[PDB]
């Protein structure tokens, strides 16, 4: 629709590209195997919120009714853009920031915005990834350290916060890290945890020192292991009988929790996040294979599994959630089995989780006086399934408890954490690719000191900012990022693809591209959704952002080791000096889309 003066003469125009095939190997890397290409795309998409936020959002939207707004946005918006993602990087055969230069050169705020989101999410994930290794260092041993309480100072029973709450948590607010109360007070620096952060930066830098070459040989193992070990953990769940309890909690269809506005919203944010989008490394990934490679069914293949395996990941955790809730359901009851015979004294054989309550009626009938002194702790499954956690606690203060309900409890403590390490590490590649592909499109730096020297400039450049997360206050900074950083601005970066291909590039100009790559135009629903449907849905959920922008006041949790009714959290708001930086972390990636064009308009006027 737009004229674009100078639209062409920057693209390779469909008739010389067959000749560039036989000269690309001397200038650019290549996928040296068919099998090594599939290992890259699955590992960047999966995990890290599909494992902790997506199964949590099951039981906050209705368990057995959660799939319906969830599964559709696979087959309405994911399967367009990923097939669109494959088709242009194989067309232009060039980096992502170069793409929005070859289309309307008053653009290229977009290639920055892909880099300005990919660099921060690559930062604070490695903070989480370091704690995966930290608890893995704390593995290997007979009495796992979170299992027991530290004593008091008198060689007797335990300290107060390990008495008032479980030993799995206490080892988190002093052990994992020393904790602060608020976000406004920075405490200890956690210097040994800073060493654990430091080594986490290096196994990345070891593996992508030569970009496609070193990663292409180091993807054959890290992209198969996080799916196998998760297969025996499923039978481990049916080994310890604790399944069919959170499993039936996964099958609770709440039709009342479907017409909510945030039901479509929270489903829409995760399906955009379950795939790893708006980074541009996949443009370079689809530039390193053959030109006539079928990516149409490859768009069907890899999009299906990551939406299908994540459901199967949600099965294994609720078996554990059902397992932890199972034994805790009777622990208070066995205490009350003890508390019944405490004051009212039945023989220990003729008491069980049975007519216990009926014999309690005979106890109250024989005497009400001592019956008014025996307190009983009422318990219920869905009073033990009704507690939950999101973000971090599922593997750190929830999963490690049922780890300690195993006969080989230090051994499965090891096997849990290499799986989640390589899970984030495989997802730590395209955000790493999202910062180097616009970097090769900068070219104001000296072009000497080749890529291995440039590789050392990335890992030590972003080494520095993770230091504030090692503070006692540093965990409260991390709660900002999963909530705000990359929640809203991920959408409209993807929306600028829709305006470019239809009204600037021309969908019919894209139509002659697809008969070149594979041949004949695909099924007609492909051509429908690029016109209308993906432009429709992306702004409805963006409209739902303004519904949840300010309709609930911003509040973050504080721990307070000296808390009033201590075994619960405390939710306080932020100070006014904290409000000045919350717009910086999520807003400045969105400012560059008009922002460079204003600099470009005063540069060319």
């Amino acid at each position: 629709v737009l004229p674009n003066p100078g639209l062409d003469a920057r693209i390779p125009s469909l008739a010389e590209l067959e000749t560039i095939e036989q000269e690309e190997a001397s200038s650019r890397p290549k996928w040296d195997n068919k099998a090594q290409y599939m290992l890259t795309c699955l590992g960047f998409c999966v995990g890290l919120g599909n494992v902790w936020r997506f199964p949590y959002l099951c039981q906050s939207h209705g368990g057995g009714a959660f799939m319906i707004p969830f599964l559709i946005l696979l087959v309405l918006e994911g399967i367009p853009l990923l097939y669109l993602e494959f088709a242009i990087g194989q067309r232009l055969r060039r980096g992502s920031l170069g793409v929005w230069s070859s289309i309307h050169p008053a653009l290229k705020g977009l290639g920055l915005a892909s880099m300005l989101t990919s660099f921060m999410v690559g930062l604070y994930y490695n903070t989480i990834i370091s704690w995966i290794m930290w608890y893995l260092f704390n593995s290997f041993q007979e009495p796992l350290p979170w299992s027991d309480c530290p004593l008091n100072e008198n060689q007797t029973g335990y300290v107060d916060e390990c008495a008032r709450s479980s030993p799995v948590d206490y080892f988190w607010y002093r052990e994992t890290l020393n904790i602060s109360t608020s976000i406004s007070d920075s405490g200890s620096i956690q210097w040994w945890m800073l060493l654990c952060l430091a080594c986490a930066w290096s196994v990345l830098y070891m593996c992508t020192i030569r970009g496609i070459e070193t990663t292409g040989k180091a993807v054959y193992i890290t992209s198969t292991l996080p799916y196998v070990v998760l297969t025996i953990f499923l039978i481990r769940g049916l080994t310890l009988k604790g399944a069919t309890n959170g499993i039936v909690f996964l099958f609770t269809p709440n039709v009342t929790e479907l017409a909510q506005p945030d039901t479509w919203l929270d489903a829409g944010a995760q399906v955009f996040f379950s795939f790893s989008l708006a980074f541009g490394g996949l443009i370079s990934f689809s530039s390193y294979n053959s030109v006539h490679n079928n990516c149409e069914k490859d768009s069907v293949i890899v999009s299906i599994i990551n939406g299908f395996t994540s459901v199967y990941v949600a099965i294994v955790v609720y078996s554990v959630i059902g397992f932890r809730a199972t034994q805790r359901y009777d622990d208070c009851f066995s205490t009350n089995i003890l508390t019944l015979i405490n004051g009212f004294d039945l023989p220990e054989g003729n008491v069980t989780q049975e007519n216990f309550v009926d014999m309690q009626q005979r106890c109250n009938a024989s005497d009400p006086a001592a019956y008014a002194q025996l307190v009983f702790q009422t318990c219920d499954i869905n009073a033990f399934l009704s507690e939950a956690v999101e973000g971090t606690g599922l593997a750190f203060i929830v999963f490690t408890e049922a780890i300690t309900k195993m006969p080989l409890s230090p051994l499965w403590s090891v096997l849990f954490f290499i799986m989640l390490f390589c899970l984030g590490l495989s997802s730590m590649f395209g955000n790493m690719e999202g910062v180097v592909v616009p970097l090769q499109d900068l070219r104001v730096i000296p072009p000497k000191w080749p890529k291995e020297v440039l590789t050392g400039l990335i890992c030590l450049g972003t080494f520095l900012i993770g230091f504030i997360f090692t503070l006692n206050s540093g965990q409260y900074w991390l709660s900002l990022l999963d909530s705000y950083a990359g929640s809203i601005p991920l959408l409209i970066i993807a929306f600028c693809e829709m305006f470019s291909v239809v009204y600037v590039y021309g969908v019919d100009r894209f139509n002659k591209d697809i008969e070149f790559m594979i041949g004949h135009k695909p099924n007609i629903f492909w051509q429908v959704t690029w016109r209308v449907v993906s432009p429709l849905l992306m702004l409805i959920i963006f409209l739902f952002f303004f519904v949840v922008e300010v309709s609930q006041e911003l509040t973050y949790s504080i721990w307070d080791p000296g808390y009033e009714e201590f075994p619960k959290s405390q939710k306080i708001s932020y100070p006014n000096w904290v409000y000045v930086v919350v717009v910086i972390v999520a807003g400045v990636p969105s400012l560059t889309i008009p922002g460079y064009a204003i600099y470009k308009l005063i540069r060319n006027h």
């Binding site: 290794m133 930290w134 893995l136 260092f137 704390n138 593995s139 290997f140 041993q141 060493l195 654990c196 080594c199 290096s202 196994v203 830098y205 070891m206 020192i209 030569r210 070193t214 291995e452």
Partner: peptide, 30 residues
Amino acid sequence: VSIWLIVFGVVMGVIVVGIVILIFTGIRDR
């Protein structure tokens, strides 16, 4: 002294040598 620094001590030695192995390959492929 510490058990978590024992398992930390072996993985910090793995990290130092693999980066210079690929340095020798890139210098042999100049």
